[PDB]
Structures are given as structure tokens and as C-alpha cells.
Amino acid sequence: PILKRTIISKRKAPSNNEDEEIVKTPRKLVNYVPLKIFNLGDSFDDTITTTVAK
Amino acid sequence: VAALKEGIQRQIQNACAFCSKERIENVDLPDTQEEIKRELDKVSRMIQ
Amino acid sequence: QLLPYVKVKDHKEKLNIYKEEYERAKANLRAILKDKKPFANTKKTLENQ
Amino acid sequence: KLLRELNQTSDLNERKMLLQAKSLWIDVAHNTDACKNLENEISGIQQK
Amino acid sequence: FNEREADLKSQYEDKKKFVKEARDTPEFQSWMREIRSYDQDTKEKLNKVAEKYEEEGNFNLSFVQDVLDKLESEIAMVNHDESAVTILDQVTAELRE
């Protein structure tokens, strides 16, 4: 009823989440920038628990 | 690649500091990071 | 009991972004297809030249 | 007795330590596979 | 321009494949069955708890992180549960006796 319609999202409510710029923004020919030092995880520190394991 | 290799060297030094990197590969766990993050949160809550 | 809110919201957001990407891609494809014919006409004029 | 309780908690703690070490090892594996992909890309660019 | 338009057409076909994959998902197959499950008990207490949940969600200003945080907190709370719950009436009855 009202709950289902409020929970559901109308496809017309937004502009189909349109992106910025008519076409995709240009990028550098290499532009690798690997980074990715941490992939998720993190949270509790490893050094303290490693000392706890020792 | 040199910066990524330096980062990999720091990560492997941390892995050697924390138990051992070579002693972890034998254990079986899903590769997906999101599942591992959820498991870490679950075990952290269990420890709390 | 109801539709999963996180999943429905994620599905709606991904559908919206996919639809807008499809719309921009089809608009660009129509524009390039319309623009291609003058290039063929210019090639014909250049062969006449 | 508190130490035995600490051992019971430490079983989960070492399980969490193994899970975090597995997460760090998978992060290292992701970095290494991405480095291998960058090496393949640089090898293709070097071939070009 | 022909190779660029061929690449754009290939990207457009890939985007159409992604759009087609976005719909008719196993999650969509799960949908319209959860609607039947909700229709099994219509409103009443379920409407009130749903309104309370909606109020909590809009107050939290989150729809994904808030739900996951609440789910993790409730699972952690349920982890310590059912402590000596096997006998509840007999102990009270013997205490009263």
C-alpha cells in the first residue's frame, strides 16, 4: 500500500540519475596511479593484535 | 611500478611482522574483500 | 517481509545510472550516425575534386 | 581461571588475527596481481 | 571516425548488455514474492512498525550504512542470548512454593 509506494523509487522521480557532461570526461593516456594500499579491512589495528598473538 | 613495489615491500614487511605472509596462504578464505571486511567486523563485535 | 530497502535502493540507483549512460551513449551514437553522412558527401565531393 | 577464559577468548583473537593477516595477504595479492597486470601493460607498450 | 564510432557502438552494446543484466536479476525473481509475503499479513502492527522504521531511517539520514550498522549491532546483541532459558516457569513456581 502506502509503505510499498514510499519504499519503492519512481523511475521518473530523478532524471535517471543523469551524469555530469554530455560525454564522458577525458583522461590522461597512462594515468595509472595504482595506490590501493588498503582494500577494505582496516578497522582494528594489526600491530596490537599481533602483539596479543605473541 | 617502483612506488607500487615500495608499497608491496611495506605490506609484506607488515605481513612478516604480523604472523607470516607465507604461513597465511595455506588457510582457506573467500577472496572477496567485502566478505572479509564483514567477517572482520563480526569477529571484532564478538571480541568486544 | 517487504522488498529489501538496501537492495531496492541499490538496484534503482544502478538502473538510473545505467539508463542515463545508455541514453547519453544512444544520443552520441545517433549524433555520430547523423554526422557520418556529410563526411560521405564530402568524400564524394573530394573524389569529384 | 581468568587465563583459561583468556585462552578461550584468544582462540577467537588468533582467529581474528588470522582473518586480518589473510586480509593483508589478499591485499598484497591484489597489489601483486595489479603489478603483474601493469607489467603486462608495460610489456605490451615496450613491444609497441 | 569510423573506428571511433565502431568503438562507441561497441561501448553502447556493452552498456545495453549491462542495462539488460541490471533487470531480470535473481534478486528481481526474489521480488514479487516478498510482495506476496507482505500481502500475507496486511498492515495492522506491520504498518505501524514499518512507519516507525521509516521514521528511524529518515532521522538517521542513511539507507545502507545505517541498516548494516543496525544489523551488525542486533547480531552482536543476539550472540549473547538464551542463557539458562531452558527453565523459566518451574523455578518461579518452586520459588513461590
Side-chain angles (χ1 to χ4, degrees):
Chain A
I2 49 178
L3 172 68
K4 183 184 170 293
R5 65 194 61 179
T6 50
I7 287 310
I8 207 63
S9 183
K10 273 70 181 180
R11 312 317 294 141
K12 341 108 200 58
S15 60
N16 303 6
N17 269 263
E18 245 295 324
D19 58 15
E20 156 257 327
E21 228 250 279
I22 25 119
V23 293
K24 8 123 130 156
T25 62
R27 208 211 47 158
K28 276 115 266 103
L29 83 163
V30 178
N31 198 85
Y32 283 167
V33 196
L35 293 185
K36 67 161 189 301
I37 285 89
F38 58 95
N39 298 118
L40 286 88
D42 309 329
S43 181
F44 194 78
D45 303 330
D46 217 328
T47 60
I48 46 179
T49 183
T50 300
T51 57
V52 166
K54 181 53 185 63
Chain B
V1 165
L4 184 53
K5 192 177 301 177
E6 181 270 348
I8 292 180
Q9 255 79 95
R10 297 293 86 88
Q11 289 180 2
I12 67 182
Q13 283 179 358
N14 298 329
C16 182
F18 312 145
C19 274
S20 299
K21 178 179 80 278
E22 61 278 358
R23 290 176 52 185
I24 282 306
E25 46 83 23
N26 57 86
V27 197
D28 305 326
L29 194 66
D31 193 67
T32 57
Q33 294 292 76
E34 48 275 3
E35 181 268 351
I36 301 184
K37 184 178 184 58
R38 290 278 75 87
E39 289 296 335
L40 284 183
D41 299 328
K42 189 67 58 57
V43 299
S44 298
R45 290 183 174 265
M46 287 288 296
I47 292 307
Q48 287 178 3
Chain C
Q1 194 80 350
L2 202 64
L3 299 184
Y5 310 137
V6 279
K7 286 199 287 296
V8 69
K9 285 304 295 181
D10 179 70
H11 286 59
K12 288 323 177 173
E13 288 296 334
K14 72 182 299 181
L15 184 58
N16 282 125
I17 66 181
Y18 289 161
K19 281 195 312 301
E20 66 91 7
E21 284 167 336
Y22 162 81
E23 285 178 0
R24 59 97 185 178
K26 69 184 306 180
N28 181 269
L29 181 61
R30 288 190 311 266
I32 194 57
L33 283 182
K34 289 308 175 294
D35 295 332
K36 266 304 179 299
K37 298 181 304 299
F39 300 125
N41 299 124
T42 56
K43 177 174 301 298
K44 184 256 302 180
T45 61
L46 288 186
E47 91 181 356
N48 293 130
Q49 290 183 187
Chain D
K1 297 176 184 302
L2 292 182
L3 193 84
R4 275 179 284 268
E5 295 294 334
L6 282 188
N7 287 272
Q8 295 177 2
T9 307
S10 76
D11 301 326
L12 193 50
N13 281 116
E14 72 89 11
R15 176 61 178 176
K16 170 177 56 59
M17 241 309 287
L18 289 183
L19 258 59
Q20 198 169 8
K22 241 299 177 58
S23 179
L24 184 55
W25 174 79
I26 294 202
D27 198 315
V28 169
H30 183 206
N31 288 274
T32 55
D33 63 58
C35 180
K36 289 306 177 297
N37 297 329
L38 289 183
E39 284 178 4
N40 300 328
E41 289 174 358
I42 196 50
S43 299
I45 294 186
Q46 192 267 351
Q47 178 66 213
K48 181 183 58 182
Chain E
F1 277 172
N2 286 134
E3 76 181 357
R4 172 69 270 183
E5 81 168 348
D7 299 329
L8 290 174
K9 184 256 303 178
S10 66
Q11 291 178 3
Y12 169 72
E13 289 183 350
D14 297 330
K15 296 312 291 180
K16 289 205 308 300
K17 291 299 175 300
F18 294 154
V19 170
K20 287 192 297 296
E21 286 299 334
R23 45 185 171 92
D24 201 66
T25 51
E27 304 298 337
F28 282 9
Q29 301 296 334
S30 298
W31 294 3
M32 280 68 69
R33 258 56 61 179
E34 308 299 338
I35 303 180
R36 297 293 88 90
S37 180
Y38 183 80
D39 294 331
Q40 197 271 321
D41 295 326
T42 56
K43 304 180 186 215
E44 295 296 330
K45 196 57 170 58
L46 294 193
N47 180 267
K48 197 268 305 177
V49 295
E51 288 180 356
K52 189 56 178 63
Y53 188 88
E54 178 66 22
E55 290 180 2
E56 292 176 359
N58 57 64
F59 286 160
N60 293 328
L61 295 180
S62 180
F63 300 93
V64 177
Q65 286 290 343
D66 175 59
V67 179
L68 292 182
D69 177 69
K70 290 177 309 187
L71 175 63
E72 288 295 335
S73 63
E74 66 185 355
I75 292 179
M77 176 268 305
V78 86
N79 288 334
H80 47 281
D81 192 4
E82 303 181 357
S83 307
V85 83
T86 62
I87 300 300
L88 253 64
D89 51 358
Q90 298 181 0
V91 282
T92 57
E94 70 182 353
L95 180 138
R96 187 56 58 180
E97 287 294 336

